[PDB]
Design a protein around this nucleic acid. Structure first.
Length: 117
DNA sequence: AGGAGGGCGAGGGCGATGCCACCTACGGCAAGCTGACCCTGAAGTTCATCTGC
């Protein structure tokens, strides 16, 4: 009943049109949404921030669910089209390259294997 | 010698034993610090080790 009372309001909020992530997604707090054109060509790095006094990182975009990377070979997991400044740019703030480029070697792989599909 | 050595009844009566106010003033009852270190995680892989080959 701890969780069937949580499942049984997901099925209520998903049906009260309350705007809960629908069956494959997650209201992830995406702080620094990227803008690109129709053929690449990075346009703008908008930040969807500015909330309560500790600037919580992003407007909650209801994006494909976080895949729970959590491992030594965490780079392979590569969330679908939103991941990380280490997964999107291969830029490692503190994780070092080949732990952010291999992330980007898989995030690009994820996007491409989506593109082919 | 044999005396008698007080008998009586009073020993307070009356009222007052306080009146007046004051019984505090002032201000301070804190300052300053700390209220915790450390870890213990999911999840996954590696890596050292074991068993079997």
């Amino acid at each position: 009943m701890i969780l069937h009372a949580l499942t049984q309001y997901y099925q209520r909020k998903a049906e009260s049109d309350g705007g809960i992530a629908q069956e494959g997604f997650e209201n992830k707090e995406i702080p620094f949404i990227i803008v690109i054109d129709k053929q690449g060509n990075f346009i703008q790095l908008e930040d969807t921030r500015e909330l309560k006094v500790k600037k919580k990182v992003g407007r909650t975009f209801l994006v494909p669910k976080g895949l729970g990377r959590s491992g030594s070979k965490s780079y392979e997991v590569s969330n679908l089209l939103w991941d990380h400044y280490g997964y999107v740019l291969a830029y490692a703030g503190e994780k070092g390259q080949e732990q952010a480029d291999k992330q980007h070697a898989s995030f690009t792989a994820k996007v491409n294997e989506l593109k082919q599909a």
